[PDB]
């Protein structure tokens, strides 16, 4: 049951992740920073971790009464 | 790795017999016992543990039984910011006499095209400063462009003007790939890039990488040098996220190179004498020149059109790989109008009112319509003459000739061909000038006032001067 050894013994191996954020990667951060840069820059440019403030405009108007 | 022996040398095709460890297809093999490095790319497994290969350099002096060593990978070229300001050939050797290219990573020149889920639909107009391009068939940031033309219509001058304008306005590591072109033009471009500061031989802030395989190279080098330049640009796009410019001149040569070995690889010719694998080779090459979600590649490709055909299989196959084709015409260059862009044959996928604005689109369509009407009226003009035209039609012909002249523009790189100064017309100025010509705002000015001017203010000033002289 070679793969069945794999499937349990490795998911168990990944489950031992108490201090592990990404299960002993030692890498993948060098590109994660790029992905999160691209993903964030294509969703916007401000800080997308806070609430947005709102500035609002008022339509323009002119002199309309009979001159 | 594995060692074999040359068993046949016919032209640029070499057969190698491996006793142990037949190399996969597309591997690079090194011939042992040669002064300069000769590389053979595997193309076919012939059976009986023999492989057919294409030579990247000359095959003279090769002997049957000469030892060939397997590298275990395709041609690997150095990639990185160290390639900027350098010139490499098809196999990545530095051919600028400036020493080795000490990058820290090498990339194989054969890779898979980006997937479908990696495509980006963003279309943003790239203003070049050229009147006819921006007006009728504008280029987009991250799109594939393509410049079609026969021999001597101005593909190189236009691609050099684009280099000048965009690349000096750009901040994203351009890459030029000379594919089967004149070596004289390569030296010219190298030195006009050094003197322009784009390539810096000291204090390495160079922003262009050059890859060159010219007309004197064997078919294999001319077929793979486009892939080499593509791989440099691909590293700049993926592993650095930068926005790359990719100039290729000429891409037709790539196609042509394949033909020059096709029958020697044992393949029945297709139509017009082209390899049976024309469309798929062009596909697997061009599908790698693309903008992905990881980066952007704007590519300008000069496409030679043999004998001004445009129906030859090579240009006709290239047409479907581009986003904004610019087709140069000899009938236009013989009028004296430069650039020789054909207004009724150029196309752009961003010539859409929802993209360029309704004013831009309406002006472009009005220009194209009045030029088509001029075409239709020229027959009547040949038969009847000019004096028997309707007055609306004389007005049409006048405005059409004026628009023809105004689409012309003096280039900064053609200052020797014309003696004129270079002009870089902004987009709004182009739209405004052509709208004003179409509206009739300049019916009183002559037509030679619009020949080789920038904005319309220059047409007015030139008319005033032409009058003040006589």
């Amino acid at each position: 049951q070679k793969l069945f050894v794999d499937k349990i013994r490795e998911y168990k191996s990944k489950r031992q992740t108490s201090g592990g954020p990404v299960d002993a990667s030692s890498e993948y951060q060098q590109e994660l920073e790029r992905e999160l840069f691209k993903l964030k820059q294509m969703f916007g440019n401000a800080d997308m971790n806070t609430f947005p403030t709102f500035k609002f405009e008022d339509p323009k108007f002119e002199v309309i009464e009979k001159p | 790795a594995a060692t074999g022996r040359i068993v046949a040398v016919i032209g640029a095709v070499v057969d190698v017999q491996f006793d142990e460890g037949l190399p996969p297809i597309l591997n690079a093999l090194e011939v042992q016992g040669r002064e300069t490095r000769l590389v053979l790319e595997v193309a076919q497994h012939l059976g009986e543990s023999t492989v057919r290969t294409i030579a990247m350099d000359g095959t003279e002096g090769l002997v049957r039984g000469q030892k060939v060593l397997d590298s275990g990978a395709p041609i690997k070229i150095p990639v990185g910011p160290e390639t900027l300001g350098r010139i490499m050939n098809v196999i990545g050797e530095p051919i600028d006499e400036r020493g080795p290219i000490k990058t820290k990573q090498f990339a194989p020149i054969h890779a898979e095209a980006p997937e479908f889920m990696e495509m980006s639909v963003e279309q943003e107009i790239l203003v070049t400063g050229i009147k006819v391009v921006d007006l009728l068939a504008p280029y987009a940031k991250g799109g594939k462009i393509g410049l079609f033309g026969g021999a001597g219509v101005g593909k190189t001058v236009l691609i050099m003007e684009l280099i000048n304008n965009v690349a000096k306005a750009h901040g994203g590591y351009s890459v030029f790939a000379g594919v089967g072109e004149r070596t004289r033009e390569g030296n010219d471009l190298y030195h006009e890039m050094i003197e322009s500061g784009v390539i810096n031989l000291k204090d390495a802030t160079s922003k262009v990488a050059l890859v060159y395989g010219q007309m004197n190279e064997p078919p294999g080098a001319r077929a793979r040098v486009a892939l080499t330049g593509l791989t440099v640009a691909e590293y700049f796009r993926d592993q650095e996220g930068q926005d790359v410019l990719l100039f290729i001149d000429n891409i037709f040569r790539f196609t042509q190179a394949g033909s020059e070995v096709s029958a020697l690889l044992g393949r029945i010719p297709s139509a017009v004498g082209y390899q049976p694998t024309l469309a798929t080779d062009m596909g697997t090459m061009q599908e790698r020149i693309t903008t992905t979600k990881k980066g952007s590649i704007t590519s300008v490709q000069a496409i030679y059109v043999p004998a001004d055909d445009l129906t030859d299989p090579a240009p006709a196959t290239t047409f479907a790989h581009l986003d904004a084709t610019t087709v140069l015409s000899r009938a236009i260059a013989e009028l004296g109008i430069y650039p020789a862009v054909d207004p009724l044959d150029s196309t752009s996928r961003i010539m859409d009112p929802n993209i360029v604005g309704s004013e831009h689109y309406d002006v472009a369509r009005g220009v194209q319509k009045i030029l088509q009407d001029y075409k239709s009226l020229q027959d009547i003009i040949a038969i009847l003459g000019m004096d028997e035209l309707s007055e609306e039609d004389k007005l049409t012909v006048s405005r059409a000739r004026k628009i023809q002249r105004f689409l012309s523009q003096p280039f900064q790189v053609a200052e020797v061909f014309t003696g004129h100064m270079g002009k870089l017309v902004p987009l709004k100025e182009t739209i405004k000038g052509f709208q004003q010509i179409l509206a009739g705002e300049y019916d009183h000015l002559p037509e030679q006032a619009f020949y080789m001017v920038g904005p319309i203010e220059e047409a007015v000033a030139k008319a005033d001067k032409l009058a003040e002289e006589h």
Binding site: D6, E10, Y11, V22, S25, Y28, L32, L36 | -
Partner: protein
């Protein structure tokens, strides 16, 4: 949250497969037992 979940579970699945490659007469005997069980 999805993209970080995708890169991670991808970096997990190729880890766990690469991590058993580092890891049997019972199998060789079991193979012939399976070939007998072919019938």
């Amino acid at each position: 949250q999805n993209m970080m979940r995708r890169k991670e579970q991808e970096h997990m699945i190729n880890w766990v497969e690469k991590h058993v490659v580092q890891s049997t007469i019972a199998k060789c005997i079991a193979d012939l037992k399976l070939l007998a069980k072919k019938a």
